[PDB]
Amino acid sequence: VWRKHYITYRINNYTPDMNREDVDYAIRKAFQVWSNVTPLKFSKINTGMADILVVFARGAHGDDHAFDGKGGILAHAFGPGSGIGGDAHFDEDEFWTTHSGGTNLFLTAVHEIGHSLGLGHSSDPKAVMFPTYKYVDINTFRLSADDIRGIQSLYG
Numbered sequence: 492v493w494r495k496h497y498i499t500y501r502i503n504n505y506t507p508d509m510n511r512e513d514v515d516y517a518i519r520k521a522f523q524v525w526s527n528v529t530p531l532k533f534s535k536i537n538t539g540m541a542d543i544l545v546v547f548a549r550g551a552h553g554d555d556h557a558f559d560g561k562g563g564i565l566a567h568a569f570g571p572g573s574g575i576g577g578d579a580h581f582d583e584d585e586f587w588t589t590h591s592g593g594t595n596l597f598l599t600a601v602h603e604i605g606h607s608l609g610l611g612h613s614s615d616p617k618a619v620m621f622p623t624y625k626y627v628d629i630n631t632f633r634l635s636a637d638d639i640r641g642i643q644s645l646y647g
């Protein structure tokens with residue numbers, strides 16, 4: 492778990508699937524989901540080393556977790572730690588979106604940031620930490636009680 496309350500993120504590179512401002516907004520809204528139920532504060536920085544580096548990448552991309560083309564694995568993230576710790580990677584071979592076309596970035600990012608914070612997978616299909624992608628309306632979205640218990644067991 493992170494041992495401090497102010498956490499930084501940096502967007503290393505932007506998918507061409509989406510408007511720049513939309514990538515910024517989805518990711519910001521996703522960190523806010525977790526800010527809402529912990530003492531953590533998140534800030535985007537533009538240069539330098541962040542805690543959580545947000546990367547869009549395809550295939551082999553320098554870690555030991557290659558992506559697999561369109562479908563299958565959508566994204567992965569490392570738990571808290573220095574260097575690659577915390578970093579969240581999104582498969583560029585998906586088509587990222589604001590809505591239900593393709594793969595919703597916001598929802599995926601909430602799930603991945605959960606990992607960045609120290610959460611593992613849930614068995615509850617209602618939880619955002621369930622592995623299986625299922626679109627739900629991005630204004631209807633709520634963490635499940637399982638999710639809140641999980642993160643609060645780690646930070647609050």
Ligand SMILES: O=C(CCCC[C@H]1CCSS1)NCCCO
Nearest residue numbers: 564565566598602622623624625
């Ligand atoms: O784990 C992911 C990210 C998607 C996580 C699923 C949550 C967020 C999208 S809707 S609920 N890709 C590999 C899963 C595919 O088997």
Ligand SMILES: [Ca+2]
Nearest residue numbers: 542574576577
């Ligand atoms: Ca990191």
Ligand SMILES: [Ca+2]
Nearest residue numbers: 560562564582
């Ligand atoms: Ca994939």
Ligand SMILES: [Ca+2]
Nearest residue numbers: 508583585586
């Ligand atoms: Ca893409």
Ligand SMILES: [Zn+2]
Nearest residue numbers: 552554556580
């Ligand atoms: Zn990776």
Ligand SMILES: [Zn+2]
Nearest residue numbers: 602606612622
């Ligand atoms: Zn996962």
